[PDB]
């Protein structure tokens, strides 16, 4: 958990996502499922 979430935030920052509500919702995610959900959601929006 304390790995996928960090790499998630790094992935978002590298992708070009300046979303505080993104980073917080990264930290708020407690399961890999949620992490993928948040990333996919905002990345889909960003793309």
Domain 4-46 CATH assignment equals 1.10.8.40: yes
Spatial CB neighbours of 6, under 8 Å, sequence gap ≥ 6: 26
Number of neighbouring beta carbons within 10 Å of residue 26: 22
Q: ∠9-20-17 over CA atoms, to 5°?
A: 55
Q: Where are the domains of the chain?
A: 4-46
* Experiment used for this model: NMR
25 Cβ contact list (under 8 Å, min separation 6): 38
Residue 31 CA: distances (Å) to CA of 11, 18, 21, 46: 17, 22, 18, 23
């Amino acid at each position: 958990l304390k790995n996928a979430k960090e790499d998630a935030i790094a992935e978002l920052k590298k992708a070009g996502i300046t979303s505080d509500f993104x980073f917080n919702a990264x930290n708020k995610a407690k399961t890999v499922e949620e992490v993928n959900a948040l990333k996919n959601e905002i990345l889909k929006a960003h793309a």
